[model samples]
Every structure is written in C-alpha cells, then in structure tokens.
Target: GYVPAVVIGTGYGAAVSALRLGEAGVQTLMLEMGQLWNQPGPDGNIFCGMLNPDKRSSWFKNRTEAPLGSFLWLDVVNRNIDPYAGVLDRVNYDQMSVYVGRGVGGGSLVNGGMAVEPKRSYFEEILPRVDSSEMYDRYFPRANSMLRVNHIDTKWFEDTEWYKFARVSREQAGKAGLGTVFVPNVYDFGYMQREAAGEVPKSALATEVIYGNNHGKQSLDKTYLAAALGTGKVTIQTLHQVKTIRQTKDGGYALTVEQKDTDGKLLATKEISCRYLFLGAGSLGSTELLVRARDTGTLPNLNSEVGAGWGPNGNIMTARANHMWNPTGAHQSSIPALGIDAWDNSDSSVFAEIAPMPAGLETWVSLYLAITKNPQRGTFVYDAATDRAKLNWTRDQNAPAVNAAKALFDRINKANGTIYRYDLFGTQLKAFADDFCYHPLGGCVLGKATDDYGRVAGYKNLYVTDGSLIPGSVGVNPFVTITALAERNVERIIKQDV
Candidate 1:
C-alpha cells in the first residue's frame, strides 16, 4: 500500500495530525493496531460497560486487567472473556506496569474525560524547547475547543446527587485547608443530567468509564477522528500494526506492516511506502519500534536518543479511608470532576484528583490519583535475546514520587484525622501504589530526539507527534497537551515541508 502521509496510531496526536493534514489538502492515512469502535455491538452497546466488562476492554486477552488489581485483598474484579482486539491494554515490565488504550480512539475511548491544561510555567520547565506562548495562545484553545471539553455545570455539580462523593472529597480537603479544584472534563454534563433524570440510558451515570463509554463521552472518534474522515482525504486501517520502518533508496520511507487477527495470529504482512510518516503510536509503542529498527541495523543512523528520558508521568494512586461522618455516597458518578490541588506544596509537587470509586456499595473511601514531580527517568534498549524493547526503570527511581505523595497525604491524614486505605492497593504497607502507570510518557524526546517541530534529527519526512515527545512529565492529564503539541508541530510542518 502507498500513501502520501502515513500516521501511525489513532490517539490524540494522530487524530489532530490527520484532521489538520486533511484540512491542508494533504492525503493522509492512519494505521491503528486496534479496532474501529465506530458502532455498537450486537447487544446494542458501543462498549462493554465497566461493571460487566468483556473482551472489548482489552487487546486479545481472556482476562480483563484493571489498573487496581484488588479491592478488599481479593482478586474479585477481573473476569475471563474470549480473546480479541479490545480497548485497554496493560503492558508489563519488570517493576512497572502501564495501561494503554488499544482501540481506534486510543486513550480517548477509555480515559477519564479530564481535559487538563498544564500550568504554563511547568510546561516551560519540563519541555523548555517548546514555545509556551504559541502553545498557550493558539493550540491549547484549539485542542480544547475541538475536543469539546467542558466544565461540569456548577449549579448541577453543587446540587446533584451523583457528585456527592466529589463534594465529600472537597469538604475533606477544606478540613485540611488544602486546595480543591473542580476539574474540567470532556464528557457532556448536559447529557449526564438527562441520564440522572431517567430520560436516557446511563453511561457516566451508570458507573461506566475506564472501560468505554456507551454514550455521552465525546472521545476522539466522535471529535477529531470523525472530522478527519469527513474531509475525504483521510483514511484509517485498523488491526494494522507497523513492525518496522526503514529509509528507502528512493527518498521516501518503507514500512513493514503486520496484519493480525484478534488472537495475535499473523493474518498478513504488507509492505507500505509513504512520503511522510508520523509516529503517534504512544511513548512505548513508538519508542519500541524505533529502538528495534536502530538496534536491528534497519536505521543505523538513528541517534542514541531514540529510547531515553522516559518516566511514568510521575503517577501515584492511593485512597484514604474517611471518618464515619463523611460517608462517600453509594451512587457515585464514575467520571471524576474534582481534585485535591496540592501542586504548591513546598515539600513535594503533587496534583491529586479525587477519583471516583464506582463500586455499587459505599466503600467509605476518599480516593485519589496523584501526579507527582519525580525527577527520575528510564531508558528503553532493544533486547536482542527477546527481540523486544526493555525498559530500565528501577523501583528506586520511584522514591521522589512516593515520598511526595506520602508526605502530602500524610498532611491530609493528620489534618482531617483520616487514614490511608491500605486494603485497596493489595498488600502494600504504605498507601501509595507506585508499581503501575496510566500515563506513560517520554522516550524519543522532543529536543533530544527530534527538532522543535517533531521532525527526527537524523531523518527527513519522519516525525513524532505523540507522548514520546514530552521529555519527562507533563504535570497533568496529557491528552490535551499531546493534542495541542501535535497541533503546533503539524502547523509548522505544513508551512515548512508540505
């Protein structure tokens, strides 16, 4: 197969790039390693709801692997299903496990709809090479608008029965005199009100998130990807994984693609040629592909920076057991719309979201998912023995984040007389669970591996417009930042190259 511009993966980065490229009158094609997620299943639902998840929640796996491994020191959460190409994929490493979306909409299909913009100072601090002015002035607004991001209705949030848990968390934060913020989300709050009123079938109101939303979550497919296809210049091929990329003697690039069935069986291998290539296969996928190409001698000239400067996006998930007086409501909305904003804590930099505990029964836990400023980064190296990329992320590197979250929560515990929920994160003595990451960022960094415009330093017409470009940590939910950065880079690319 041949195309002018071939974009790998259909996440926020790829979706933005495709939409902009199509608008610029460029012929663009997208290769996705997952399914199309365009229509509902035979049961009249778009995705398997989180409560009773099936094969649609994972990539060719029988058992569903949720981020939280256990609830009450028991493995009662996951279920066995037939293997098929699904939405969420949990990638395992030695000490770290990362959860990623595997469908056409990428993370947008399965993520909490919190569209956050990083503080400009922090954005400049981490990605110093990127222009903060342009990102703030132009692309952030564009990405937010195009993604249909909105804040929860203030009146509804304050009065609604569904968000009682959020209100409880906010009140607890006030007891500690800690800052609490109403986080904006991409889910339509107006639609949510109707669901609560029994006028429509439920999604967020039905404890449906993280797996996939059956309705009202405006994922990338409903937003940018749909718009991209409407331009009549963009096309997408799902279940097509790019195995290798090499520079061609003629000046364009050559790609070897593996078309696989839901069971990981290779259906076909196709050779593809593209004048331009954008790697939006996320941090892990994009970095692994490049590292293999470099180590295998397919692209020997690729710099040593191909697989470096990666972090867990400094993630920490922990929950707090509240006092008997502060019982978090049983009817909790799965969509999180509030967070404990403790970023200004001088001891540690932490921004914590008051996440939803959507188990039907009241857990009496004030849950938090924090993003910390961990200064540690890992490197990915091609392992010849296994013929795969191996990450050098040690457990010791996680101390900064662990200490930071522990200290902040320690303060909250001390102030409110609340204790850390120990049983939620399995058998850990401490509250912070640092083994897994939902936001895996970096590898193929922006200034080190690619130019400011995302063109690889050693190659022409090759670009990275994904989370791999973010150097270490983005300090917030990254889909917005990824979309904005892709928007910025693709605009420059259209001007200079295309």
Candidate 2:
C-alpha cells in the first residue's frame, strides 16, 4: 500500500498533521495500533468504569493496573481481568512505569483533562530556539480555541458538591499561604453540570476516567481526528502498528506494519510506502522505532540524538490525610479543576493539581499530582535481544521531583496539621509516588534530533511531530504544548516542504 503521506499513530500531533495535510489536498493515512473504541461490548458500553472494571480497562494484562494500588495497605484497588487490547497501557521499565493511552485519541482519552499552558518565561527557558512571541500570540491561542478549553464557573465551583475536595484543598493551601488557581480543562463543564443535575448520563462524576470516558471529555477522536476525517482526504487504519521504517530506493519511506486484532492476535504484516512519513506515535513509540532502526542499521544515517532527551515530566503523586471533621464528600469529579501554582518559586518550582480520589465514599484524603521542575533527564537504549527501547532512568533520579513535591505539600501539612497518607501506594510508609509518571515527554528532541520545524536530521521527507519533540518538561500538562507545536510545525511544512 502507498499514500502521499503516512502519519504514524492518531494522537494529537498525528491528528494535526493529517488534518492539515488533508486540507492541503494531500491524501494522508493514519495508522493506529489500538481499536477505534466506538464498538460496545457485551455490557452495551464501550468502556468500563474505574470502580468496577473489566478487560476494557487495560492494554494486554490479566489484571487492571490502576495508579492507586492500595487503600490502607489493602490490595482492593486493582482487579483481575481477561487479557485484551484495551485503552491504557502501562509500559514497564527497570525502575519506572509510564502510563500511556492506546487507541485512536492517545493520551487525550485517559488524562485528567487539565489543559494548562506553561508560563511564558519557563516556556522560553526550556525551548529557547523557538520564537515564543509568535507561539503566545498565535499558535497557543489557536490550539486552545480548537481544543475547546474552558474554565469552571467560580460561582458554581464554590457551591457545587462535586468539587468539595478541591475547595478543601484550596482552603488548606490558603492556610499554608500558597496560591490556588482554577485550571482550565477540555471536558465540557456544561455537560458535567447537566450530568450532575441528572439531565444526562454521568461520566466524570461516575469515576470514568483514566481507563476511558463515555462522554463530556473532548478527546482527540472527538476533536482533531473527527475534523481530519471530515476533510475527505484522510483515512485512518486502526489496529495497525508500525514496526519499522526504511527509505526506499526511489527516495521515499516505507514502513513494515503489523495488523492485529483486539485479542492480540496477529493478522497480517504489510509494507506501506509513502512520499512523506511523519512519526507521531508518542515519545515511547516514536523513539523506540527510530532507535531500533538506527541500531539495527536499517536507517544507519540517523543521529545519536534519536533516543536522547527523555524525562518523566517531573510527576509526583502524593496525598494528605484530612481530619474527620473535613470530609471531602462521598462524591467527587474525576476531572481536576484547581492547582497549587508554586512555579514562581525559584527554589523548586511545583505546579500541583488538586487530584480527586473518587472512591465513591468519604475518603477524607486530599490527593495531589505535582508537576515539579526536576532538571534530571534520562535516555533510551536499543535492546538488541528484545528489539525494544529500554529507558535508562533510575528511581533515584526522581529524588528532585519527590523533594519538590514534599516542599510544597509539607507546608500544607504543617499549616493544616495533617499527615501524609502512606497507605495509598503499595508500599506501607511511602508517601510520594515517584516511580510512575502520567506525562512521558521527550526522545527525539527538537533542534537536536530534528530540525527546528521537526524534520529529521538525516533524512528528507521524514518528520517527527509528537511529544517526543519536546525536551523533557513543559512545566504543565503537555498536550496543549504538543498540539500547539504540531500546529506550528505542520503549517510551516505544508507551506514550504509540501
């Protein structure tokens, strides 16, 4: 099979590229390894809930691996299920675990829906090669507008029962003299309010995040991918995984792709050729493909920076034990709406989202998912035996992230006279979860592994437009940054290269 353009993975960057390419009168094809997620199972629902999950909750594991492994050191969180190609994938490394979304929409399907923009100063600091002025004035606004990002109504937030935990967290932060900001999100707040009012079936209020959401969330499939498909020139092939990439003799790119079923059964392997190849299969997927190609001598001209500049985006999950007098309520919304804005602190900047437990009970726990400014980074190496990319990050490298989160939460704990909840994670006394990260950024960094416009270093017509282009951290949730950067890059490429 051949096409004018082939964009690997149907994530944010890939969806943007496909949409722009289609709009430019180019025939683009998108390959997604996971299912389309539009089909319902025997229970007549597309996805399973977090509280009572089934095989639809995991990628290919016999059990569901939720972030919260225990409650009071009891193994009652995760449940055993049948192995199937599900939505969320927890890629396990030596000392780290990366929770990535599968299927067409990518991380947009499983994230907490916090649409945050990085501070202009920090954005310029991390990516100095790019023009921050143009991004702030043009690309960021365009991206946010297209994403349908919205803020919660302050009046509703103050009076709503769903956000009691957020208000409690904000009060604790105020007692500690820390500022709280209402974070914007892609989830439709009006639909959420309607759901709360029993006008519609509940999704966010029913603990239907992380695995998947049945409604309200504006995932990529509902936004970019839908628009791309409406362009009439873009075709998406689901359950098709790209395995290898090599340059053809005619100066074009060809990919060795494997088609699989939902039960992880291999169907057929096909070779697809394209004039322009875009790698947007996320940080882990794109970097691994390039690294393997380079190490295996298929794409020998690839640079040493292909698998470099990798980081966990400095994510740390910690919770505080609230007093019995302060019950966080029996109901909570899965989407986060408030965050402790401590990034202006020069000592150790931390922007911690006030996370919701949503246990459907009075847990009296204020959880936080902190995004710290950890300067440490890791690299990926090609494993010849398994033909996979292995991350070289260690558990100790997360010390800076842990310390930064501790610095902020310790103040809240001290001011509110609360203690750390050491029974959330699997370990007995561990308060901070520094091993796994929801945000896995970098690998194939911009201006290092690729040109300023995301063109690969050693090849023509081969591009990278994904989270892998960002180097390590973006100070906040990275989807908006990734989408904005993709818009800028694809627009430039369509005008110049196409």
Candidate 3:
C-alpha cells in the first residue's frame, strides 16, 4: 500500500503538517514511537500525579524519572511502576540528558503549556535571513489561533492564590530592578478560573503539569491533531518507529519501521511507501534518523550539515530558598504564568521562568528554570559499533549558561537576601543543574541542513518540520516557533508541491 505523505513523530510540527496535508485531501499517515496518552490505567486515572508519578509518566521503564531528580537524594522520588510506561522520554547522552514527550501529542502532552513567541529583535538577530515581518504578521498569529492559546484573566490572576508564587517572584524581580512579564499559556484559563472558584475540578490549578492533564488543557490532541482527524484524511499509528528512510527506485520514499510491544520488544519489521516524507520526530529523534541514514550509507547523499549545529537551547535549572516571610506556598499551581525576562542584558542573555515547587506542603522555596544565550554547540555523529547516533555535548560546554544565569540570580539574591537552594536538583551542593535540557533544539538546522522552507538538501520530496530546524535557541519557549515554522513550510508545499 502507498500513501501520499507520512509524518514521523506527533509533535507540534507533525500535527500541524498532518492537518494541512489532510485538509488538502492527501492521505497522510503519522508514525509515533509512543502511545496515545488518552487512556487511564487500572487505577482509573488518565494521568498519574506528577509528584508521585506511576507507569503513565515514563517510557517502558520500571522506575520513574521526575526530571528534577530528588530534593533529598533519598531515591524515594521515583515510584515503582510496570515496564510499559509511555509518556516522557529521557534520552541520555554522554554528558547531558534531553527530555522529550513520548506520546501522540508529543511535548504538548507533558509541557507546562507556556506558549511563547520569540522577540522580533532576537529572532532577526539569530535568524538574520528569515523574513521576520512575514512570520510575526502571519504564521505566529495563525499558529496561536490554531493552537487555542489563551491568557490568564488579569483580575483572576490578581486575586487567585494559585499564582501567589508567581507574584512573589515578580516582587523579587522588581526589587532587583529587573522586569517580570506574564507568559501566555495554552491551558484553558477560563476553566482554571472556575477551578480556582471551586465550581469545577482543577487541572492546571490542581498541580498537574508534568505527567499529563486529565482535563482543560488544549494540547495538540485537542487542537491540531483533533482537526486533522476530523478531516478523515489523516491516520496515525502508535508504537511504530521509523528505523530507516530511503528513496525508492520508482521515486517514492520507503521507510523501514519497527512495531514494538509494551515490554519494548520488537514485534515486526515492515516497509511503507509514501510520495512525500516529513521528519517531525523532534530534535534528537529526527537528527538521529538523518545521521544514521547518512553514516550507514542508506541515504548517502545527505550533506555534511546533517548532524551539526545541535544544542540544548541553553537550559539551566536552579532553586532559591525564600524567607518564610515570602513563602512560595504549600498548595502551588503547577502552571507557570509568569517569566523573568532578562534577555535584554547585553553581556548575558537570559529568560528565566519562575518554576513552581508544588509539594502540597509549604517549604518556602522558589525555583527558577533559566534559558540563557549559550553559544555552545554540539554535533551528532553515527557510531558504527552501536548503530546509533552519539551526541558530543560536553559538560564544560554549559559554562556560558551557568555564568549568565548566576549573574541574573545573584542580583535577585542580593536584593532580597536569599541564597540558592542546594538540595532540590539531584545534588546537595549543586547550585545549577546544567546537564539536562527539556528544550533540545537544532541538529538538522534550517538554512544549513535544509532549505529556507525546510526541504532537505540533496533530496526531493523530503522535509523536516520540527524543532530540529531551530539553530540552537529561540530566546523563549520553542513550541510556538516550531508550530509557526511548520505552518509556513506546509502551506508553501501544499500550494506548489503537494
């Protein structure tokens, strides 16, 4: 059987591309390495609680991965679960680890729902050749509308205790003479308002940011993916991972795929044919696919830039112990509605989000996850021995991010007489957790590995429509940009190629 198009992975890019292709009457099939996250476990809960995560939170593992590690290094943080979890995936590299979603909606299934667009000046500065006016006026607005992006009601935000931690962080940012701004989210803020008013059960208001939202968050499954399905032209297959992609003799693309079982055992090997192939398997996943194809001589025409220019989007996590007089809160909402925007700093660019420590018990701690402008870059090379791609992102490469973040946090600490929390992030004395990144970007970067419209070089009818197209960092959350880029590219392809 043959299809018009096949999309690999089900993230923002994949969802948007599939929807557009479906609307154009193309028979599109999407392959996901993970499962649909809509089903409840035997416990009758759609998602496990984040603080006490179960099998629903991780990918085919016996132990849970909290991402924050442990507050006391007690090893009690990871709860026991069966070996068939399929939600968040922690891809381990040499010195750093990357976290990406592993289900139908991809990052939309697990992200904090911070839908942010990069600043125009920063966008132009980084991607100098891109048409800034077109993106700001058209694609961004369209992406926001399609994704059901929403803002917190300012009146509700001013009164609700759900955001008290954000307000406290805002106070300290003001005391440091810095700026704090409300970050928009895709969560249904109206529902959250009701949840806060006790008229409805809470999702964003109920400390459900990590594992999966049981209700009220308009993740891609409720937005783009839903629309794509409604068109009746799109189909998706879960647990079907694309192992290799190569051009056929008759001009279509052939994919060697693996269907794996719940125990992570390979079940079958098959080949699928499609006229158009889109790689939206995320940064690491898509990059690995391309790198393997090239290195293994399967698709030997891939250019030198296939695995270059990879980065972790300058992510660093740190926490501070606030005075009991300025406690963060015992019952904190996991939805982050605010950010500390210090990207305007010339010496060091940083956009810090005031993360919530939702422990259900007052601890007087404030957490911050800062995205700095680290110029460090890594390359993914194929390993012949392991038959997989290896990323060369060294720990020393994180120095720039650490210095920039430390500078910003030091100002807040000095202004309010606070100290860094040493116990929260895996190590007792670690001031900055620099080895993990939730926002991995680049590898198959735009303008180098692909054309301006994401058409891969040296290949016809091949495209990349994911975060792999970003150079390294976006100076904000990356999903909005990924969706916008996919929209722009797919629209062009639909008009001319499809």
Q: TM-score winner among the candidates?
A: 2
Candidate 3 lDDT tens digits, 1-498: 678899999999999999999999999999998888766677677877666677777887788865472354324567777887468888899999898898899999989999999989988987887899999999999999999999989888888888888889999889999998888899889998888788987777666777888877888989999999999999999999999988888868999999997678899988989999999999999999999999888788999999999888889998888888997777677788899999973549889888876566777777888998988899998998998899999999999999999999999999999998877775458889999999999999989999988899988899999999999889898999999989999999888787
Better TM-score candidate (1, 2): 2
Error of 2 at 150 (Å): 1.5
lDDT of 2 by residue, 289-377 (tens): 99999999889999999999999989999999899988888788989899999997354899988988767778888989889888888
Assess each prediction's global lDDT (C-alpha) against the native.
0.86, 0.90, 0.87
Which sections of candidate 3 miss by over 4 Å? 67-70, 73-77, 345-347
Going through the candidates in the order shown, the clash numbers are: 0, 0, 0
Give the runs in model 1 whose Cα sits over 4 Å from its true position. 66-70, 73-77, 345-347
What value does the lDDT take at residue 350 in candidate 1?
Answer: 87
RMSD (Cα, Å) for all candidates, in order, is 1.5, 1.3, 1.5
- In candidate 3, the residue pairs with backbone N, CA or C atoms under 3 Å apart (3 or more residues apart, or in different chains) clash, namely none
Cα lDDT over the full model 1: 0.86
